[PDB]
Amino acid sequence: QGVNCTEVNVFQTRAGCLIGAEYVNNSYECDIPIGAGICASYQTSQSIIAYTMSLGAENSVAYSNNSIAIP
Amino acid sequence: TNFTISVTTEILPVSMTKTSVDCTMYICGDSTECSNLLLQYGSFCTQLKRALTGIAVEQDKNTQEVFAQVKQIYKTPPIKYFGGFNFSQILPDPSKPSKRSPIEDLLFNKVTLICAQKFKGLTVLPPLLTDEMIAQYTSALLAGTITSGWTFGAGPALQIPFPMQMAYRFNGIGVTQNVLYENQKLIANQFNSAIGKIQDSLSSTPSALGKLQDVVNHNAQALNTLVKQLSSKFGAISSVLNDIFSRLDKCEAEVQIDRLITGRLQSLQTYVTQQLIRAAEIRASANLAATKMSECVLGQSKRVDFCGKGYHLMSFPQSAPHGVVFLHVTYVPAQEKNFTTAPAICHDGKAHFPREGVFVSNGTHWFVTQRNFYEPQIITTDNTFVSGNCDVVIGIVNNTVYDPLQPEL
Amino acid sequence: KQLSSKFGAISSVLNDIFSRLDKCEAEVQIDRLITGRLQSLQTYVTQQLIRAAEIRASANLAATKMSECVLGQSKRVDFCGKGYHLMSFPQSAPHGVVFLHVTYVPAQEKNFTTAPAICHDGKAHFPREGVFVSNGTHWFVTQRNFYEPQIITTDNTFVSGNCDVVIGIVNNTVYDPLQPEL
Ligand SMILES: *[C@@H]1O[C@H](CO)[C@@H](O[C@@H]2O[C@H](CO)[C@@H](O)[C@H](O)[C@H]2NC(C)=O)[C@H](O)[C@H]1NC(C)=O
Ligand SMILES: *[C@@H]1O[C@H](CO)[C@@H](O[C@@H]2O[C@H](CO)[C@@H](O)[C@H](O)[C@H]2NC(C)=O)[C@H](O)[C@H]1NC(C)=O
Ligand SMILES: *[C@@H]1O[C@H](CO)[C@@H](O[C@@H]2O[C@H](CO)[C@@H](O)[C@H](O)[C@H]2NC(C)=O)[C@H](O)[C@H]1NC(C)=O
Ligand SMILES: *[C@@H]1O[C@H](CO)[C@@H](O[C@@H]2O[C@H](CO)[C@@H](O)[C@H](O)[C@H]2NC(C)=O)[C@H](O)[C@H]1NC(C)=O
Ligand SMILES: *[C@@H]1O[C@H](CO)[C@@H](O[C@@H]2O[C@H](CO)[C@@H](O)[C@H](O)[C@H]2NC(C)=O)[C@H](O)[C@H]1NC(C)=O
Ligand SMILES: *[C@@H]1O[C@H](CO)[C@@H](O[C@@H]2O[C@H](CO)[C@@H](O)[C@H](O)[C@H]2NC(C)=O)[C@H](O)[C@H]1NC(C)=O
Ligand SMILES: *[C@@H]1O[C@H](CO)[C@@H](O)[C@H](O)[C@H]1NC(C)=O
Ligand SMILES: *[C@@H]1O[C@H](CO)[C@@H](O)[C@H](O)[C@H]1NC(C)=O
Ligand SMILES: *[C@@H]1O[C@H](CO)[C@@H](O)[C@H](O)[C@H]1NC(C)=O
Numbered sequence: 001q002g003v004n005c006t007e008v009n010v011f012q013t014r015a016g017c018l019i020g021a022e023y024v025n026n027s028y029e030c031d032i033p034i035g036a037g038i039c040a041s042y043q044t045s046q047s048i049i050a051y052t053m054s055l056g057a058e059n060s061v062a063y064s065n066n067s068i069a070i071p
Numbered sequence: 072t073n074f075t076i077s078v079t080t081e082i083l084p085v086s087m088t089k090t091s092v093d094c095t096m097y098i099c100g101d102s103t104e105c106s107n108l109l110l111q112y113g114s115f116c117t118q119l120k121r122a123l124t125g126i127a128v129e130q131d132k133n134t135q136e137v138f139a140q141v142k143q144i145y146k147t148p149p150i151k152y153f154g155g156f157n158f159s160q161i162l163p164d165p166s167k168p169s170k171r172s173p174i175e176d177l178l179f180n181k182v183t184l185i186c187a188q189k190f191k192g193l194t195v196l197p198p199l200l201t202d203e204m205i206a207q208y209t210s211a212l213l214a215g216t217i218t219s220g221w222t223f224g225a226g227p228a229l230q231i232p233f234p235m236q237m238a239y240r241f242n243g244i245g246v247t248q249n250v251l252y253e254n255q256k257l258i259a260n261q262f263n264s265a266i267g268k269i270q271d272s273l274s275s276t277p278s279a280l281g282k283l284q285d286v287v288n289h290n291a292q293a294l295n296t297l298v299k300q301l302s303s304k305f306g307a308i309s310s311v312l313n314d315i316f317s318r319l320d321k322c323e324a325e326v327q328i329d330r331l332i333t334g335r336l337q338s339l340q341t342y343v344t345q346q347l348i349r350a351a352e353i354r355a356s357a358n359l360a361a362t363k364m365s366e367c368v369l370g371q372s373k374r375v376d377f378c379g380k381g382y383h384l385m386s387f388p389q390s391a392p393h394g395v396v397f398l399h400v401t402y403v404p405a406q407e408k409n410f411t412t413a414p415a416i417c418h419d420g421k422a423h424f425p426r427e428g429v430f431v432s433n434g435t436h437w438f439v440t441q442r443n444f445y446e447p448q449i450i451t452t453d454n455t456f457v458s459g460n461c462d463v464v465i466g467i468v469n470n471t472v473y474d475p476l477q478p479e480l
Numbered sequence: 481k482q483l484s485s486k487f488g489a490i491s492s493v494l495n496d497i498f499s500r501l502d503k504c505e506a507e508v509q510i511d512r513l514i515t516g517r518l519q520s521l522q523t524y525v526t527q528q529l530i531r532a533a534e535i536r537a538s539a540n541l542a543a544t545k546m547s548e549c550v551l552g553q554s555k556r557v558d559f560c561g562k563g564y565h566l567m568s569f570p571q572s573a574p575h576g577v578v579f580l581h582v583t584y585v586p587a588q589e590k591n592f593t594t595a596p597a598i599c600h601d602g603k604a605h606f607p608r609e610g611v612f613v614s615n616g617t618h619w620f621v622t623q624r625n626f627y628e629p630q631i632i633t634t635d636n637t638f639v640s641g642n643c644d645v646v647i648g649i650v651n652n653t654v655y656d657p658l659q660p661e662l
């Protein structure tokens with residue numbers, strides 16, 4: 001926390017830098033918080049991985065001025 | 072007979088800075104003997120670390136509760152025609168380097184050494200959610216409340232045009248669709264004028280964003296007070312452990328170290344208690360803000376003076392530094408007119424109570440008008456129900472009614 | 481465990497200080513123990529007060545939720561559960577309460593073509609409850625929450641003004657129940 005790895009699988013973030021966890025470009029629903037939009041999780045062999053948060057499921061709503069949808 | 076559409080801005084704090092306070096570095100750094108005496112002094116450090124960890128967890132949960140409320144992230148359409156509305160002030164602008172709106176770009180610019188505090192065992196943990204994630208959540212909420220209305224708050228999002236949603240909100244507050252569908256351009260112009268006026272008020276007056284600035288100033292003052300209390304002598308011979316170690320031997324400095332801890336740990340406990348009280352106040356404010364978000368952003372509330380002063384229609388959430396900003400769009404009527412009214416009328420021996428509204432007259436003829444708008448309509452049997460006779464009703468007046476079946480005969 | 485700490489004294493128990501030290505010089509040790517044991521007691525009372533205030537706020541929220549979801553139906557969104565809440569089941573829990581919120585979540589959406597208003601002969605017919613939707617051929621009056629196809633009549637539509645200022649008007653006919661009588 002607050003200590004760069006230069007002064008000390010290596011990745012750095014806003015809170016600091018961490019070792020032992022790799023970086024994954026794909027973003028899932030994380031469990032263990034890390035800080036500043038980063039998370040940590042145990043996924044597949046099995047190892048601790050780090051990735052950015054998924055904001056949510058993507059769903060684009062087609063807006064029209066003359067159409068409606070009723071259940 | 073008329074109305075004035077105004078936008079009311081409400082500022083509510085959501086979270087604060089997460090601060091983690093070291094024990095050994097704050098109390099007495101680079102001192103093994105002082106650390107030895109400190110451990111004997113007890114296990115206060117574990118309790119303080121647990122308290123600050125719980126405070127940070129509570130603030131994190133508060134941020135996730137207030138902001139992360141939707142399961143899916145919605146996207147605005149590229150071309151925007153919301154019935155001739157100027158929504159570009161609240162929509163994200165791709166031309167800006169950040170995804171925040173120009174209103175938000177004015178909002179983050181109105182809210183304001185760290186190395187000295189960082190050296191003496193005081194560290195500020197960064198917030199878990201960055202500003203980009205909060206801006207994306209705000210954009211998703213705006214897209215949900217604009218392109219789908221309040222249907223996305225309950226369950227799945229159902230697309231609906233913005234004038235049709237506005238007519239739904241008018242029917243919710245009791246206003247017929249005639250006012251909207253006959254004065255749509257006037258309503259749009261009034262909304263644009265209110266948006267421009269509130270933007271000019273936010274630009275000219277910097278005192279509107281006061282609560283977040285007060286919280287930041289209180290946190291900075293508490294940190295400065297903690298630093299100056301570290302600078303206090305606490306009745307010893309010196310305020311630094313290095314001078315006591317250089318002058319006194321350890322056995323003679325035992326009493327001075329004890330006198331320093333008795334008072335330094337007390338200042339730590341006082342700071343922790345003040346932080347806990349401030350965290351409880353922030354938690355109450357964040358619960359109120361989350362309730363306001365869920366009951367004004369995700370739907371329409373009939374409660375008076377909860378979603379802004381006046382007849383509330385909709386609220387636009389805005390991202391703020393360590394807080395949230397609500398843009399309450401309210402319906403304020405104007406241009407009053409005196410009238411002569413009666414509570415009921417009876418045509419032929421039987422009273423005709425109106426279903427909605429009351430009977431008003433301009434002096435010669437009686438008409439049926441709504442509660443909030445002056446729409447003169449002829450008295451018929453469709454909007455009036457018959458019950459009893461006009462023998463016990465106080466203030467009755469004799470008048471005739473129009474029967475639609477009469478011209479048929 | 482804080483009772484087990486020495487707190488700057490030579491022992492963590494008063495019996496050892498009483499046995500070893502005579503009372504006059506052990507006055508300082510007893511005073512040093514009290515200054516710190518009373519402080520730990522005050523810290524415990526303060527933490528208990530903060531926890532009791534948080535529990536009181538949570539209990540007030542739970543009582544409000546019980547009174548406005550169990551004793552009645554609330555129109556407030558996301559207060560009595562996510563979705564269109566109907567009625568909730570109170571339940572007993574150890575040092576707490578459990579709410580079983582029964583909500584109404586619609587599904588199986590279907591696209592449709594809609595118009596803000598329909599005028600038959602020079603006069604607009606705005607609907608009272610529900611909106612005009614069309615599957616491609618004919619227009620029908622269905623409510624907001626459910627798709628119930630009904631023929632457009634004069635009972636669910638009120639006449640007000642003309643269709644000269646309404647944006648997006650469409651020309652269609654209406655059913656008059658008095659017409660088959662003639
Ligand atoms: C609604 O209002 C926005 C103001 O934010 C309009 O955007 C401006 O439009 C004027 C004239 O159309 C341009 O001269 C400006 O350059 C636009 N602003 C920016 C930042 O580019 C928007 O056009 C309006 N929508 C309309 C009129 O349909
Ligand atoms: C109801 O109020 C609106 C706005 O307060 C009035 O609209 C104004 O009308 C004047 C007269 O032509 C114009 O000069 C202004 O530019 C209009 N303002 C806006 C924002 O549209 C409207 O006339 C009022 N209606 C009645 C019946 O009094
Ligand atoms: C009250 O309003 C009614 C409705 O507009 C007025 O009745 C009209 O009056 C004008 C002027 O004499 C006539 O040309 C219309 O034929 C009347 N219409 C109906 C349906 O009767 C009435 O005059 C108004 N009274 C006052 C005192 O202003
Ligand atoms: C409305 O009309 C009724 C009937 O024409 C009026 O009732 C009459 O009132 C007078 C005055 O005391 C009595 O002498 C009659 O016996 C009443 N007739 C009946 C059938 O009740 C009534 O007063 C009128 N009200 C107003 C406000 O003009
Ligand atoms: C739109 O819905 C209407 C009513 O549900 C459909 O009209 C029906 O069509 C069937 C097919 O021949 C007839 O048997 C019924 O008698 C019709 N009912 C009425 C009231 O006209 C219409 O076909 C539908 N259109 C589309 C494109 O699906
Ligand atoms: C509904 O029908 C009316 C009547 O035919 C249409 O009004 C005509 O519109 C055209 C085009 O602007 C004019 O040239 C005629 O003079 C209008 N006639 C009358 C009697 O007003 C109206 O446009 C139709 N609406 C739709 C949506 O089709
Ligand atoms: C660590 O140092 C490198 C080199 O300048 C820098 O790019 C990086 O941002 C630093 N990380 C932190 C957490 O300060
Ligand atoms: C109606 O008349 C009263 C006088 O009795 C006056 O005080 C009031 O202002 C009038 N209402 C309006 C809207 O002018
Ligand atoms: C209103 O009150 C006055 C004063 O008591 C009374 O004279 C008058 O008859 C009342 N009007 C009605 C319609 O009751």
Ligand SMILES: *[C@@H]1O[C@H](CO)[C@@H](O)[C@H](O)[C@H]1NC(C)=O
Pocket residue numbers: 061062069589590591
């Ligand atoms: C309705 O059509 C739009 C495209 O215009 C589409 O995005 C949407 O998913 C459709 N909804 C349903 C329920 O078919």
Ligand SMILES: *[C@@H]1O[C@H](CO)[C@@H](O)[C@H](O)[C@H]1NC(C)=O
Pocket residue numbers: 065066152647648
């Ligand atoms: C919907 O918007 C498009 C784009 O401006 C426009 O061409 C079309 O006429 C609009 N439809 C209605 C019914 O207003």
